[PDB]
Amino acid sequence: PLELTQSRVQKIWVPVDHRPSLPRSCNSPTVIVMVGLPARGKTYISKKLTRYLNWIGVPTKVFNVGEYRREAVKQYSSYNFFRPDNEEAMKVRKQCALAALRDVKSYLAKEGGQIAVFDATNTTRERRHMILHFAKENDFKAFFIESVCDDPTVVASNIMEVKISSPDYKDCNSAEAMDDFMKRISCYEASYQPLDPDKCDRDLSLIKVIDVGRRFLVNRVQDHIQSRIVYYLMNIHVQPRTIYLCRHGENEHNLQGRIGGDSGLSSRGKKFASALSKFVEEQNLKDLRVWTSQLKSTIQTAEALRLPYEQWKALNEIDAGVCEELTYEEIRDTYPEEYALREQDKYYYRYPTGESYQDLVQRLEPVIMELERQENVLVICHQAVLRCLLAYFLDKSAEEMPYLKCPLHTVLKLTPVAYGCRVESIYLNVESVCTHRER
Amino acid sequence: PLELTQSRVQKIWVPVDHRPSLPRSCNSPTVIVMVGLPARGKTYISKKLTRYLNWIGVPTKVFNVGEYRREAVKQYSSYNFFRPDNEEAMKVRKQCALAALRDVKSYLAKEGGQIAVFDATNTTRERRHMILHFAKENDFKAFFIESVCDDPTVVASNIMEVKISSPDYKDCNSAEAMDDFMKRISCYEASYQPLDPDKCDRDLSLIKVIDVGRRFLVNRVQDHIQSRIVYYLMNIHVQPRTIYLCRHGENEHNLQGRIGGDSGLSSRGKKFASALSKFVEEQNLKDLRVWTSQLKSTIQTAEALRLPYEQWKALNEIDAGVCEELTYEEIRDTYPEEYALREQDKYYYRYPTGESYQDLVQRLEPVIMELERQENVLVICHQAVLRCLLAYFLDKSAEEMPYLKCPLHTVLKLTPVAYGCRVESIYLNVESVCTHRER
Ligand SMILES: Cn1cc(-c2c[nH]c3ccc(Oc4ccc(NC(=O)CN)cc4)cc23)cn1
Ligand SMILES: Cn1cc(-c2c[nH]c3ccc(Oc4ccc(NC(=O)CN)cc4)cc23)cn1
Ligand SMILES: O=P(O)(O)OC[C@H]1O[C@](O)(CO)[C@@H](O)[C@@H]1O
Ligand SMILES: O=P(O)(O)OC[C@H]1O[C@](O)(CO)[C@@H](O)[C@@H]1O
């Protein structure tokens, strides 16, 4: 009894499965409901939350009712389409919401999706009662995220940043698009019934994000994922800042083509460290937090900056287990089965007594949460760690992640803009070996 | 340039410190303010939060004004001491609060304390304005935690569970103590001014815990620690449950006196696994979550239960680095310097390319957060992992933690009661080797 086998790729101990003569094949999804008037950052919340949930391994998809509308109604003319007295467009808009819900059902019940973010105004109790009915009948959980903001400066900024550039306003100039959008918001104000956790919405699971995250009303958080979302929303901010990501300067193991270890900077690596200090100085940042791993090469690179820095064990390079300090040639010759398994499944593959890219994500989640809280940050890390962090910021899949290009002596400058990061690459003109290996 | 040395105990790379001829020695603390009427679980929140913060490595202390009062006023007679018209006792109570604040200043500014939990009613704006003045003048941050509850069943339950058993009610019977405490609560109701984040307390950093954690009002979370507290308060619950903790059944490495590795159950270990299944069955639990590490020995133990289980990489035994699969005799003979360093500083000591008990805490924090969310849970883990989890539940220090007794083939049954866990040990009558080593 208790006979187990270790799975070759992930290295997971499973019961030996001696399937009989005729082998037989043999928790609840969530609908996240966005609530609020237009230009309240609902799409911003939807997209950022989906990016985070997918990166941590929770399959998530956004269903934006406006995109179903742009598909059903070819060209957008004006706010007149959104008028409450527009009988025809009101029918079309309802059909679009129902078509999005149909796709929500298919995603969660038939495609292995775990979270569906229903991105619409959902400003009336009637619409929300209909979404609740849809969730109850399909055995889906419902979690409401309402964004409430009365600041006209914030509303005008959102229109200027991401609304005027919408495909709806292609033939319009900035002034007419802004004016049309203000009229469009006014169409929703009369029927808008905010969430009432005090009386009406007392039994609903919800978060009210008030005044661009200054205040929060949290009601009946049922589970782990809702609690995580709430914690995430409370850590993110919309303040302007820059994230600089780079690897340690070239090390002695890099020169020998050896993986892992705790080797020091080569002469070129030390030159990069000096070049990085000059680069950092030229950026003229009021305050800058510097984060390193606990491995020597990243600390030596930070030492050249003459700035305070913090060492994180979570930033340490992927653990290669038995393959640590070996070259890839020595891995292929000593462990050919292991080498081929990794090449076939680079994300899920776990090194013996070591890690996978999947393990890295789990380790890096507190790093991501702290990066969100912070402003200007410089992260000096390692190739696999950098690919993982970059996949979060650039919304790259688990399959793409182990192959992202993160060259040595190159700074990745990340600027948060619209619904994602602008990425600028800055090579600091110091030669190094190449550690990138394609599939 | 960039000359570093690796610290012998923690294995941290530090700049080589060539101190000159005359060597010279060369963030803001927080006051957590509890707010609310008596029997609102303020002391329960204070104690649990302090236990969690200390375990994660944030030095925290509770300053309970009632304990300063029991010290100043020898014997407690009745609610008459708490009367608003009691001029003398009102002076004494103020002096006690000021004496507690004096000790808060000394703890945070002179003893290396990071968080001071000011556990009092702090029901008036006047008292809170005075605490704010004290925080501003000492450069301390202020974070308010208010517990609001109108349920008379909850109030009566709190009085019966932990108030009637208070040193104040030693000479009283349950009925008179309950009656006196109800009158005592009434003394505070007239002057009680709840936190108003809408108008008056808009600029204060606060959390309102409403109806025993059913709802939360979160205002202006400034930093990392406040955000963590909020997340913790949202994950904990007061629902009745049991936590069972045990190690995997005896393994082959245990028999050889070898550390780490991924060996399977010995014949005795398999006998424990059967004994554990019978024990679990006899507990008659409606639902039970079973958690294991990703190491074979814990999975084989769970396999004997015939219950669904979840494997956590965070539950894997402490990593011994270069000392993995070695006996302690082989460690002392091959690495005598390393052996002696560990014996001297067992909590902070890091194995080369391995971990410390300090690293274990960081890894286990998500385990603790999930244990808090759950109800009936059985954790099948390893000696060092178990000591770490037990130190959290039993409020043991970093210094005590590496020496806690966690024998093989023994279940630790944890029952949450009053202000901490009741611990019952259940030996399942199966022989094994002893892996415990005293200082
Ligand atoms: C850059 N940008 C901001 C908006 C924007 C306009 N109104 C909004 C309303 C909500 C919103 O989401 C959040 C904002 C803040 C936070 N939590 C915090 O801050 C807590 N420390 C969470 C979500 C974004 C916007 C659009 N573009
Ligand atoms: C066992 N006991 C409960 C009380 C008690 C009486 N009123 C209280 C008021 C507050 C309180 O703290 C919290 C309760 C719940 C939660 N968060 C959740 O639930 C969220 N999922 C956080 C703190 C405890 C008590 C006393 N003893
Ligand atoms: O996942 P890949 O492509 O092997 O890259 C990760 C490797 O890169 C390095 O950082 C440098 O080669 C190694 O330490 C690590 O094993
Ligand atoms: O910290 P200590 O006392 O060495 O105990 C931890 C050790 O106990 C074991 O679980 C069993 O001896 C080892 O795997 C591990 O190294």
Side-chain angles (χ1 to χ4, degrees), chain A residues 1-23 25-73 76-90 92-109 111-135 137-149 151-159 162-169 172-182 184-198 201 203-270 272-277 279-285 287-328 330-331 334-398 400-404 406-437 439, chain B residues 1-23 25-73 76-90 92-109 111-135 137-149 151-159 162-169 172-182 184-198 201 203-270 272-277 279-285 287-328 330-331 334-398 400-404 406-437 439:
Chain A
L2 322 166
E3 205 195 331
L4 309 181
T5 186
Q6 190 164 53
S7 82
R8 281 202 305 161
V9 173
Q10 297 191 89
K11 309 293 187 295
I12 301 307
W13 289 99
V14 294
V16 297
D17 189 2
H18 289 327
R19 306 254 268 177
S21 60
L22 269 49
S25 78
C26 198
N27 73 140
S28 266
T30 305
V31 185
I32 293 182
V33 188
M34 301 309 303
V35 183
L37 290 178
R40 260 72 184 176
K42 290 181 312 292
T43 295
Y44 178 82
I45 294 152
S46 297
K47 287 175 172 291
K48 206 179 170 148
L49 200 60
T50 292
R51 176 159 66 79
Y52 165 76
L53 291 162
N54 275 310
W55 183 79
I56 66 157
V58 178
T60 307
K61 198 177 167 171
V62 178
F63 298 85
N64 173 283
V65 178
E67 290 169 341
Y68 279 81
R69 184 263 300 170
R70 277 183 280 268
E71 186 56 44
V73 182
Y76 174 73
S77 17
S78 80
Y79 71 89
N80 283 273
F81 182 83
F82 294 96
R83 274 161 70 167
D85 65 338
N86 197 328
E87 209 173 61
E88 186 174 272
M90 285 283 284
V92 164
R93 288 169 55 221
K94 191 163 189 179
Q95 287 167 6
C96 291
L98 288 168
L101 288 173
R102 223 164 284 134
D103 290 353
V104 163
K105 186 186 165 173
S106 170
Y107 179 73
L108 298 182
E111 294 162 42
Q114 267 288 125
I115 311 258
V117 180
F118 194 65
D119 182 22
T121 47
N122 306 314
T123 46
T124 68
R125 289 181 176 146
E126 160 263 320
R127 182 55 45 95
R128 296 190 301 263
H129 216 57
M130 188 256 119
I131 304 156
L132 279 160
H133 172 74
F134 163 85
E137 78 181 353
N138 283 291
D139 263 87
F140 300 155
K141 286 184 167 186
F143 179 65
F144 295 80
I145 307 181
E146 185 181 31
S147 180
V148 187
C149 184
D151 209 307
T153 298
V154 169
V155 172
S157 114
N158 182 282
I159 297 156
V162 84
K163 295 299 181 258
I164 57 150
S165 60
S166 160
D168 289 339
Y169 299 105
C172 293
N173 64 67
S174 299
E176 29 191 37
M178 158 68 91
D179 192 70
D180 182 75
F181 207 86
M182 289 309 290
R184 186 161 148 175
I185 292 163
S186 88
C187 293
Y188 289 92
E189 287 178 311
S191 57
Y192 179 38
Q193 302 169 286
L195 296 181
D196 185 30
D198 280 53
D201 301 307
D203 302 306
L204 303 191
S205 290
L206 64 96
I207 188 168
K208 262 196 190 269
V209 178
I210 304 148
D211 299 327
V212 200
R214 196 116 38 214
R215 198 205 285 182
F216 305 90
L217 215 173
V218 181
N219 192 65
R220 287 186 196 263
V221 163
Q222 306 174 72
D223 65 19
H224 170 73
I225 212 80
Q226 288 170 14
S227 201
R228 282 260 217 144
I229 288 153
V230 167
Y231 178 60
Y232 183 78
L233 292 174
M234 289 188 47
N235 287 325
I236 69 166
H237 63 81
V238 299
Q239 255 46 70
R241 48 85 158 257
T242 316
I243 298 154
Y244 304 85
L245 305 176
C246 77
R247 293 165 64 183
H248 53 87
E250 189 193 60
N251 63 42
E252 304 289 13
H253 272 31
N254 293 148
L255 291 171
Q256 297 185 266
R258 305 198 167 271
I259 74 164
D262 196 9
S263 68
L265 295 184
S266 66
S267 55
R268 290 144 130 201
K270 299 193 185 186
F272 168 65
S274 304
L276 180 66
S277 192
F279 172 79
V280 163
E281 210 173 76
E282 291 168 341
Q283 296 300 291
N284 216 331
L285 311 146
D287 297 290
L288 179 73
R289 295 284 290 260
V290 181
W291 299 350
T292 70
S293 74
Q294 287 179 353
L295 305 173
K296 185 179 187 168
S297 66
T298 70
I299 298 152
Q300 277 181 294
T301 307
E303 273 289 311
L305 305 169
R306 306 157 327 263
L307 287 184
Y309 62 91
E310 200 171 10
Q311 308 185 23
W312 291 69
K313 190 162 198 277
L315 286 173
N316 282 10
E317 190 49 321
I318 195 167
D319 188 337
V322 300
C323 295
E324 276 285 308
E325 315 234 17
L326 260 47
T327 68
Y328 290 103
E330 286 167 0
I331 290 152
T334 318
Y335 310 100
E337 198 184 275
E338 289 307 315
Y339 187 96
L341 284 168
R342 191 166 199 261
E343 272 200 288
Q344 289 158 14
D345 210 355
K346 214 175 154 186
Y347 181 84
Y348 296 100
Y349 173 88
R350 210 186 234 99
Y351 273 110
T353 81
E355 288 175 307
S356 62
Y357 272 81
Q358 183 177 218
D359 296 337
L360 265 187
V361 170
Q362 262 224 329
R363 257 220 264 144
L364 292 168
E365 199 273 344
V367 175
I368 284 313
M369 210 57 92
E370 198 49 38
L371 276 168
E372 286 300 345
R373 291 210 54 88
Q374 292 297 326
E375 307 212 327
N376 301 321
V377 191
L378 164 61
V379 183
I380 308 168
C381 53
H382 307 267
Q383 188 166 245
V385 166
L386 185 38
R387 293 176 166 148
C388 291
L389 297 179
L390 205 68
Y392 168 76
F393 292 112
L394 300 189
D395 196 20
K396 303 296 178 180
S397 73
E400 298 178 274
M401 187 191 294
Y403 300 101
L404 299 178
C406 303
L408 280 164
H409 303 177
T410 309
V411 178
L412 299 178
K413 188 184 164 158
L414 299 170
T415 306
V417 69
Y419 297 136
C421 282
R422 170 181 175 229
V423 57
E424 287 180 69
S425 180
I426 315 105
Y427 176 53
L428 297 193
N429 195 37
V430 182
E431 285 296 333
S432 69
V433 293
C434 188
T435 64
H436 196 266
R437 327 206 320 141
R439 49 223 302 181
Chain B
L2 322 166
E3 205 195 331
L4 309 181
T5 186
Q6 190 164 53
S7 82
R8 281 202 305 161
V9 173
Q10 297 191 89
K11 309 293 187 295
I12 301 307
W13 289 99
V14 294
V16 297
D17 189 2
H18 289 327
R19 306 254 268 177
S21 60
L22 269 49
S25 78
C26 198
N27 73 140
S28 266
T30 305
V31 185
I32 293 182
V33 188
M34 301 309 303
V35 183
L37 290 178
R40 260 72 184 176
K42 290 181 312 292
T43 295
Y44 178 82
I45 294 152
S46 297
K47 287 175 172 291
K48 206 179 170 148
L49 200 60
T50 292
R51 176 159 66 79
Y52 165 76
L53 291 162
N54 275 310
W55 183 79
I56 66 157
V58 178
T60 307
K61 198 177 167 171
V62 178
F63 298 85
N64 173 283
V65 178
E67 290 169 341
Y68 279 81
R69 184 263 300 170
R70 277 183 280 268
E71 186 56 44
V73 182
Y76 174 73
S77 17
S78 80
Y79 71 89
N80 283 273
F81 182 83
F82 294 96
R83 274 161 70 167
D85 65 338
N86 197 328
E87 209 173 61
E88 186 174 272
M90 285 283 284
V92 164
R93 288 169 55 221
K94 191 163 189 179
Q95 287 167 6
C96 291
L98 288 168
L101 288 173
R102 223 164 284 134
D103 290 353
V104 163
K105 186 186 165 173
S106 170
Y107 179 73
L108 298 182
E111 294 162 42
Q114 267 288 125
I115 311 258
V117 180
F118 194 65
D119 182 22
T121 47
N122 306 314
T123 46
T124 68
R125 289 181 176 146
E126 160 263 320
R127 182 55 45 95
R128 296 190 301 263
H129 216 57
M130 188 256 119
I131 304 156
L132 279 160
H133 172 74
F134 163 85
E137 78 181 353
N138 283 291
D139 263 87
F140 300 155
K141 286 184 167 186
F143 179 65
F144 295 80
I145 307 181
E146 185 181 31
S147 180
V148 187
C149 184
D151 209 307
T153 298
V154 169
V155 172
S157 114
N158 182 282
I159 297 156
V162 84
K163 295 299 181 258
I164 57 150
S165 60
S166 160
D168 289 339
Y169 299 105
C172 293
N173 64 67
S174 299
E176 29 191 37
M178 158 68 91
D179 192 70
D180 182 75
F181 207 86
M182 289 309 290
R184 186 161 148 175
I185 292 163
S186 88
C187 293
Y188 289 92
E189 287 178 311
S191 57
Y192 179 38
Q193 302 169 286
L195 296 181
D196 185 30
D198 280 53
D201 301 307
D203 302 306
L204 303 191
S205 290
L206 64 96
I207 188 168
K208 262 196 190 269
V209 178
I210 304 148
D211 299 327
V212 200
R214 196 116 38 214
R215 198 205 285 182
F216 305 90
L217 215 173
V218 181
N219 192 65
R220 288 186 196 263
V221 163
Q222 306 174 72
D223 65 19
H224 170 73
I225 212 80
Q226 288 170 14
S227 201
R228 282 260 217 144
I229 288 153
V230 167
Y231 178 60
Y232 183 78
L233 292 174
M234 289 188 47
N235 287 325
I236 69 166
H237 63 81
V238 299
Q239 255 46 70
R241 48 85 158 257
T242 316
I243 298 154
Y244 304 85
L245 305 176
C246 77
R247 293 165 64 183
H248 53 87
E250 189 193 60
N251 63 42
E252 304 289 13
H253 272 31
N254 293 148
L255 291 171
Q256 297 185 266
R258 305 198 167 271
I259 74 164
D262 196 9
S263 68
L265 295 184
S266 66
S267 55
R268 290 144 130 201
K270 299 193 185 186
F272 168 65
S274 304
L276 180 66
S277 192
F279 172 79
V280 163
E281 210 173 76
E282 291 168 341
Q283 296 300 291
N284 216 331
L285 311 146
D287 297 290
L288 179 73
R289 295 284 290 260
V290 181
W291 299 350
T292 70
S293 74
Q294 287 179 353
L295 305 173
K296 185 179 187 168
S297 66
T298 70
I299 298 152
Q300 277 181 294
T301 307
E303 273 289 311
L305 305 169
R306 306 157 327 263
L307 287 184
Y309 62 91
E310 200 171 10
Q311 308 185 23
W312 291 69
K313 190 162 198 277
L315 286 173
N316 282 10
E317 190 49 321
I318 195 167
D319 188 337
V322 300
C323 295
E324 276 285 308
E325 315 234 17
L326 260 47
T327 68
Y328 290 103
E330 286 167 0
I331 290 152
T334 318
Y335 310 100
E337 198 184 275
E338 289 307 315
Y339 187 96
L341 284 168
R342 191 166 199 261
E343 272 200 288
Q344 289 158 14
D345 210 355
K346 214 176 154 186
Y347 181 83
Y348 296 100
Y349 173 88
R350 210 186 234 99
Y351 273 110
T353 81
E355 288 175 307
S356 62
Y357 272 81
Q358 183 177 218
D359 296 337
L360 265 187
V361 170
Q362 262 224 329
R363 257 220 264 144
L364 292 168
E365 199 273 344
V367 175
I368 284 313
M369 210 57 92
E370 198 49 38
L371 276 168
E372 286 300 345
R373 291 210 54 88
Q374 292 297 326
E375 307 212 327
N376 301 321
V377 191
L378 164 61
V379 183
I380 308 168
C381 53
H382 307 267
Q383 188 166 245
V385 166
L386 185 38
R387 293 176 166 148
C388 291
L389 297 179
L390 205 68
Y392 168 76
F393 292 112
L394 300 189
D395 196 20
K396 303 296 178 180
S397 73
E400 298 178 274
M401 187 191 294
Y403 300 101
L404 299 178
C406 303
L408 280 164
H409 303 177
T410 309
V411 178
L412 299 178
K413 188 184 164 158
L414 299 170
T415 306
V417 69
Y419 297 136
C421 282
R422 170 181 175 229
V423 57
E424 287 180 69
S425 180
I426 315 105
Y427 176 53
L428 297 193
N429 195 37
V430 182
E431 285 296 333
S432 69
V433 293
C434 188
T435 64
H436 196 266
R437 327 206 320 141
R439 49 223 302 181

